Amino acid sequence: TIPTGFKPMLAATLTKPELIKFPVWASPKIDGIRCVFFGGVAYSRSLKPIPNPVVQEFAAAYASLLEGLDGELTVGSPTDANCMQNSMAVMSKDFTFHVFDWFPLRDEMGYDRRSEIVERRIADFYARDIKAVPQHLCVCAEDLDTLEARFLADGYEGMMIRAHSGTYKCGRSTEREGGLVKVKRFVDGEAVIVGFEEEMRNENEATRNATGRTERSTAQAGLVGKETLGALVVRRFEEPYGPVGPEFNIGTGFTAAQRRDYWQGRDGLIGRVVKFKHFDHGTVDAPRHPVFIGFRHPE
DNA sequence: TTCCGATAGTGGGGTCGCAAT
DNA sequence: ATTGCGACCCCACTATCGGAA
């Protein structure tokens, strides 16, 4: 059950696409749940054992075969990640583990050589389950394109990029390294302010997690409100334009200065329009990952 | 000089587990 | 049996520091 001194490998957002320094392997980003097997016990993105019992009894069967196989769990792929998560519960089954990397220990292995062991043939013996995330070889900018579209058209959220001989990084990869890059696209939109919430400072005791990430609790007993803006309660704004759809909050994309000033004059913000961006192409109700850009009409 | 790699501290959505009523 | 909160999943972003470019 022993890791070593390891923290899972995390992709980097795709920016500066000219330094994407080529031959690489492109794979589709599945919205499952990150999972890593170590010594017969399945771990999560934060190294916290998977709660579901069937997947854990599944582990150590075999520890030697399911050792260090870094992957992501799901159930009923392209539809939704919501159901891909009755694996955090302590019952109710068919998780189809997908594997897309393996961890040796700690120069070191490259992905060419690492994505060589992952082709573990569990099938001939047992054949319960397990799939290998398909990797596509790409040589030029045109190949990432012409493929991200196929992934998107098939229903995946995004595309992942891996350097052919990148080393396993126990941390978050960077663009100059090129170890792991994710390609997920934002889409702009408009909204009208309808309410406010103030920012909340968390004063609970600070704790280290397994990966050394400083973590505090959300007990709400130590949440003491600052005098800044925390989030904007808004609705979609779209010859009447007017507002449509349910109410959703936008709590990210503000500078420290904007949060202070906007809260001081929040009364004047009701009824003024803002641009925001989000994911899941379309004006779908209940947007996801909303980010505030600016006001439709500055000053 | 400027960049950036890493951390900390805010925020969004969602499903489960569990104590409390 | 229901409620209600908090942990935990998937994230995004800004601010900051000190070493790297």
Coordinates of C-alpha atoms (C1' of nucleotides) in Angstrom, one line a residue:
Chain A
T1 CA 0.0 0.0 0.0
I2 CA 3.1 2.2 -0.1
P3 CA 3.4 5.2 -2.5
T4 CA 7.0 6.7 -2.1
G5 CA 7.2 10.4 -2.0
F6 CA 4.8 10.8 -5.0
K7 CA 2.1 13.3 -6.0
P8 CA 0.0 12.6 -9.1
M9 CA 1.0 14.1 -12.5
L10 CA -1.2 17.0 -13.5
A11 CA -1.6 18.5 -16.9
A12 CA -1.0 22.1 -17.9
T13 CA -3.5 24.4 -19.7
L14 CA -2.6 24.9 -23.3
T15 CA -1.2 28.4 -24.0
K16 CA 1.7 29.5 -26.2
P17 CA 1.1 26.7 -28.8
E18 CA 4.3 27.5 -30.7
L19 CA 6.6 26.0 -28.0
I20 CA 4.6 22.7 -28.2
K21 CA 7.7 21.0 -29.2
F22 CA 6.7 18.1 -31.3
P23 CA 6.4 14.6 -31.8
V24 CA 3.9 13.9 -29.0
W25 CA 1.0 11.6 -28.2
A26 CA -2.5 12.9 -28.3
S27 CA -5.3 11.3 -26.3
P28 CA -8.9 12.2 -25.4
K29 CA -9.7 13.8 -22.0
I30 CA -12.2 11.6 -20.3
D31 CA -14.3 13.1 -17.5
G32 CA -13.9 10.4 -15.2
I33 CA -12.2 10.3 -11.8
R34 CA -8.4 10.2 -11.5
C35 CA -7.2 7.0 -9.9
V36 CA -3.8 5.5 -9.1
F37 CA -3.1 1.9 -7.8
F38 CA -0.3 1.3 -5.4
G39 CA 0.3 -1.8 -3.4
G40 CA -3.2 -3.1 -4.0
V41 CA -5.3 -0.1 -2.9
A42 CA -6.8 2.5 -5.3
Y43 CA -6.0 6.2 -4.7
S44 CA -7.5 9.4 -5.9
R45 CA -6.1 12.7 -7.3
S46 CA -5.4 13.7 -3.7
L47 CA -4.1 10.3 -2.6
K48 CA -7.2 9.5 -0.7
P49 CA -8.4 5.8 -1.0
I50 CA -11.4 5.3 -3.3
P51 CA -14.5 4.9 -1.0
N52 CA -16.4 2.4 -3.1
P53 CA -15.8 -1.2 -2.0
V54 CA -16.0 -3.2 -5.2
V55 CA -13.2 -1.1 -6.8
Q56 CA -11.0 -1.6 -3.8
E57 CA -11.5 -5.3 -3.5
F58 CA -10.9 -5.2 -7.3
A59 CA -7.5 -3.8 -6.3
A60 CA -4.8 -6.1 -5.0
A61 CA -6.3 -8.5 -7.6
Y62 CA -3.6 -8.3 -8.6
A63 CA -1.3 -5.8 -6.8
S64 CA 1.5 -6.8 -9.1
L65 CA -0.6 -6.3 -12.2
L66 CA -2.4 -3.2 -10.9
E67 CA 0.7 -1.5 -9.6
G68 CA 1.4 2.2 -10.4
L69 CA -1.1 2.1 -13.3
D70 CA -2.1 5.8 -13.4
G71 CA -5.5 6.2 -15.0
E72 CA -9.1 7.4 -14.7
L73 CA -12.3 5.7 -13.6
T74 CA -15.7 6.2 -15.2
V75 CA -19.0 4.4 -15.7
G76 CA -20.9 4.9 -18.9
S77 CA -18.4 7.2 -20.7
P78 CA -19.2 10.1 -23.1
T79 CA -22.5 10.9 -21.4
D80 CA -21.7 12.7 -18.1
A81 CA -19.1 12.6 -15.2
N82 CA -21.9 12.9 -12.6
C83 CA -22.8 9.2 -12.8
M84 CA -19.1 8.4 -13.4
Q85 CA -18.9 9.1 -9.6
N86 CA -21.2 6.6 -7.8
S87 CA -17.7 5.3 -7.1
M88 CA -17.3 7.6 -4.1
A89 CA -20.2 5.7 -2.4
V90 CA -19.9 2.5 -0.4
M91 CA -21.9 0.3 -2.8
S92 CA -23.6 -0.3 -6.2
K93 CA -21.1 -1.8 -8.5
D94 CA -18.8 -1.6 -13.7
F95 CA -16.2 1.1 -13.6
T96 CA -14.1 0.2 -16.7
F97 CA -10.8 1.5 -15.5
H98 CA -8.9 3.4 -18.2
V99 CA -5.1 3.5 -18.1
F100 CA -3.0 6.1 -19.7
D101 CA 0.3 6.0 -17.7
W102 CA 2.4 4.0 -15.2
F103 CA 4.8 5.2 -12.4
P104 CA 8.3 3.5 -12.0
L105 CA 9.7 5.2 -8.8
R106 CA 11.7 8.5 -8.0
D107 CA 17.6 9.5 -15.2
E108 CA 14.2 8.0 -15.6
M109 CA 11.7 6.5 -18.0
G110 CA 10.2 8.4 -20.9
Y111 CA 6.6 8.1 -22.1
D112 CA 7.6 6.2 -25.2
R113 CA 9.1 3.6 -22.9
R114 CA 6.5 4.2 -20.2
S115 CA 3.6 3.8 -22.6
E116 CA 5.1 0.4 -23.3
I117 CA 4.5 -1.3 -20.0
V118 CA 0.9 0.0 -19.8
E119 CA 0.1 -2.4 -22.6
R120 CA -0.4 -5.0 -19.9
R121 CA -2.4 -7.9 -21.4
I122 CA -4.6 -8.7 -18.3
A123 CA -7.1 -9.9 -21.0
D124 CA -5.5 -13.3 -21.8
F125 CA -5.6 -14.4 -18.2
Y126 CA -8.6 -12.9 -16.5
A127 CA -10.3 -10.6 -19.1
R128 CA -12.4 -8.7 -16.6
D129 CA -12.6 -5.0 -17.5
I130 CA -9.6 -2.8 -18.5
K131 CA -8.9 -0.5 -21.4
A132 CA -5.9 1.5 -22.5
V133 CA -6.6 5.1 -23.4
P134 CA -5.9 5.2 -27.2
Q135 CA -2.8 7.3 -28.0
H136 CA -2.4 9.0 -31.4
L137 CA 0.9 9.9 -32.9
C138 CA 1.2 13.5 -34.1
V139 CA 3.9 15.3 -36.0
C140 CA 2.7 18.8 -36.8
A141 CA 0.1 21.4 -35.7
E142 CA -2.4 20.1 -38.2
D143 CA -2.4 16.8 -36.5
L144 CA -3.6 18.1 -33.1
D145 CA -6.3 19.9 -35.0
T146 CA -8.2 17.4 -37.2
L147 CA -8.1 15.2 -34.0
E148 CA -9.3 17.5 -31.3
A149 CA -12.4 17.9 -33.5
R150 CA -12.8 14.1 -33.8
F151 CA -12.6 13.8 -30.0
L152 CA -15.0 16.7 -29.5
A153 CA -17.4 15.3 -32.2
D154 CA -17.4 11.9 -30.5
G155 CA -18.4 13.5 -27.2
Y156 CA -15.2 13.9 -25.1
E157 CA -14.7 17.2 -23.3
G158 CA -11.1 17.8 -24.5
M159 CA -7.8 16.5 -25.7
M160 CA -4.6 15.7 -23.8
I161 CA -1.1 16.0 -25.2
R162 CA 2.0 14.1 -23.9
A163 CA 5.7 14.5 -25.0
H164 CA 6.9 11.3 -26.6
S165 CA 9.8 10.9 -24.1
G166 CA 8.5 12.9 -21.2
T167 CA 9.4 11.8 -17.6
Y168 CA 6.8 11.2 -15.0
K169 CA 6.5 14.4 -12.9
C170 CA 5.3 14.1 -9.3
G171 CA 3.5 17.4 -9.7
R172 CA 1.9 19.7 -12.2
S173 CA 3.6 19.8 -15.6
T174 CA 4.6 23.0 -17.3
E175 CA 4.4 24.1 -20.9
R176 CA 8.2 24.4 -21.5
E177 CA 8.5 20.8 -20.1
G178 CA 5.6 19.7 -22.3
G179 CA 5.1 16.6 -20.2
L180 CA 1.3 16.8 -20.1
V181 CA -0.8 19.5 -21.7
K182 CA -4.6 19.6 -21.8
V183 CA -6.7 21.4 -24.5
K184 CA -10.1 22.5 -23.3
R185 CA -11.9 25.4 -24.9
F186 CA -13.8 28.3 -23.3
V187 CA -16.8 30.1 -24.8
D188 CA -17.7 33.7 -24.2
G189 CA -21.1 34.9 -22.9
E190 CA -23.1 37.8 -21.4
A191 CA -24.9 38.2 -18.1
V192 CA -26.7 40.8 -16.0
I193 CA -26.0 41.4 -12.3
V194 CA -28.9 40.4 -10.0
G195 CA -27.2 39.9 -6.6
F196 CA -23.9 39.7 -4.6
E197 CA -22.1 37.5 -2.1
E198 CA -19.2 38.8 0.0
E199 CA -15.9 37.0 0.0
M200 CA -15.3 34.7 3.0
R201 CA -12.0 34.3 4.7
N202 CA -11.4 30.7 6.1
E203 CA -9.9 30.7 9.6
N204 CA -10.2 27.0 10.4
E205 CA -7.0 25.2 11.5
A206 CA -4.6 24.6 8.6
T207 CA -3.7 21.0 7.9
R208 CA -1.4 19.3 5.4
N209 CA -2.9 16.8 3.1
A210 CA -1.1 13.7 1.8
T211 CA 0.4 15.7 -1.1
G212 CA 1.6 18.5 1.1
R213 CA -1.2 20.8 -0.1
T214 CA -2.1 23.2 2.7
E215 CA -5.8 22.4 3.3
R216 CA -8.4 24.0 5.6
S217 CA -11.9 22.8 6.5
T218 CA -15.1 24.4 5.3
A219 CA -16.9 24.1 8.6
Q220 CA -18.5 27.6 8.1
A221 CA -18.0 28.3 11.8
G222 CA -14.6 30.0 11.1
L223 CA -15.8 31.6 7.8
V224 CA -15.5 35.3 8.6
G225 CA -16.7 37.6 5.9
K226 CA -14.3 40.2 4.5
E227 CA -15.6 43.4 3.1
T228 CA -14.9 42.6 -0.5
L229 CA -16.8 41.0 -3.4
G230 CA -16.8 37.2 -3.4
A231 CA -19.1 36.3 -6.3
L232 CA -21.7 38.0 -8.5
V233 CA -25.2 36.5 -8.6
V234 CA -26.2 36.9 -12.2
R235 CA -28.4 35.6 -15.0
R236 CA -27.9 35.3 -18.8
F237 CA -28.4 38.5 -20.7
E238 CA -29.5 37.8 -24.2
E239 CA -35.4 44.3 -29.8
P240 CA -35.6 43.4 -26.1
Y241 CA -32.6 41.6 -24.7
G242 CA -33.6 41.2 -21.1
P243 CA -32.6 38.4 -18.7
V244 CA -33.3 34.7 -19.3
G245 CA -32.5 31.4 -17.5
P246 CA -31.9 30.5 -13.9
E247 CA -29.6 32.3 -11.5
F248 CA -25.9 31.3 -11.4
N249 CA -22.9 32.7 -9.6
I250 CA -19.6 34.0 -11.0
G251 CA -16.9 33.9 -8.3
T252 CA -13.6 33.9 -10.2
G253 CA -11.8 36.2 -12.6
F254 CA -11.7 39.3 -10.3
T255 CA -8.6 41.2 -9.3
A256 CA -8.0 42.0 -5.6
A257 CA -8.7 45.6 -6.4
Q258 CA -11.9 44.9 -8.3
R259 CA -13.2 42.8 -5.4
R260 CA -12.7 45.7 -3.0
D261 CA -14.2 48.5 -5.1
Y262 CA -17.1 46.5 -6.6
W263 CA -18.2 45.6 -3.1
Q264 CA -18.0 49.2 -1.9
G265 CA -20.3 50.2 -4.7
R266 CA -22.3 47.0 -5.1
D267 CA -25.6 49.0 -5.1
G268 CA -24.7 50.4 -8.5
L269 CA -23.9 47.0 -10.0
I270 CA -27.5 45.8 -10.1
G271 CA -28.7 45.8 -13.6
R272 CA -25.3 46.2 -15.3
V273 CA -24.0 43.7 -17.8
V274 CA -20.8 41.6 -17.7
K275 CA -19.0 39.3 -20.2
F276 CA -18.0 35.9 -18.9
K277 CA -16.6 32.7 -20.4
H278 CA -17.3 29.0 -19.7
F279 CA -17.1 25.4 -21.0
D280 CA -19.6 23.0 -22.6
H281 CA -20.2 24.8 -25.9
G282 CA -23.8 26.2 -25.9
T283 CA -25.9 28.6 -23.8
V284 CA -26.9 25.6 -21.6
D285 CA -28.7 26.3 -18.4
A286 CA -26.4 26.2 -15.3
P287 CA -23.1 27.0 -17.0
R288 CA -19.9 25.4 -15.8
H289 CA -16.6 27.1 -14.7
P290 CA -17.9 30.6 -15.2
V291 CA -15.1 33.2 -15.3
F292 CA -15.6 37.0 -15.2
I293 CA -13.9 39.0 -18.0
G294 CA -15.2 42.5 -17.6
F295 CA -18.3 44.7 -17.9
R296 CA -20.1 44.9 -21.2
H297 CA -19.5 48.7 -21.0
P298 CA -16.4 49.7 -19.1
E299 CA -16.5 53.0 -17.2
Chain B
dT1 C1' 15.5 44.0 -15.7
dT2 C1' 11.4 40.1 -16.8
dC3 C1' 9.8 35.5 -16.6
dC4 C1' 8.0 31.5 -14.1
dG5 C1' 7.6 27.6 -11.2
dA6 C1' 5.4 26.7 -6.9
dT7 C1' 2.4 27.8 -3.0
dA8 C1' -1.6 29.8 -0.7
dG9 C1' -6.1 31.6 -0.7
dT10 C1' -10.6 32.9 -3.0
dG11 C1' -14.3 31.2 -6.1
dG12 C1' -17.8 27.6 -9.3
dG13 C1' -20.5 23.1 -9.8
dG14 C1' -21.7 18.3 -8.3
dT15 C1' -22.7 13.4 -5.5
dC16 C1' -22.3 10.8 -0.8
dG17 C1' -22.1 10.0 4.2
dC18 C1' -23.2 10.9 8.3
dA19 C1' -25.1 13.3 12.6
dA20 C1' -29.0 15.8 13.8
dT21 C1' -33.9 16.8 14.1
Chain C
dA1 C1' -37.2 8.8 7.3
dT2 C1' -35.6 13.8 6.1
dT3 C1' -32.6 17.7 6.7
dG4 C1' -28.4 19.8 6.7
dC5 C1' -24.0 20.4 6.6
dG6 C1' -19.2 18.9 5.4
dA7 C1' -16.1 15.9 3.0
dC8 C1' -14.7 14.8 -1.4
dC9 C1' -14.7 14.6 -6.3
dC10 C1' -14.1 17.8 -11.3
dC11 C1' -12.0 22.4 -11.5
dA12 C1' -10.5 28.3 -12.4
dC13 C1' -8.2 32.2 -11.0
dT14 C1' -5.2 35.9 -8.5
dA15 C1' -1.5 37.2 -5.5
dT16 C1' 3.2 36.5 -4.0
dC17 C1' 8.2 35.1 -3.7
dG18 C1' 12.5 33.9 -5.1
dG19 C1' 15.2 31.7 -8.4
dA20 C1' 15.6 31.1 -13.4
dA21 C1' 16.0 33.6 -18.3

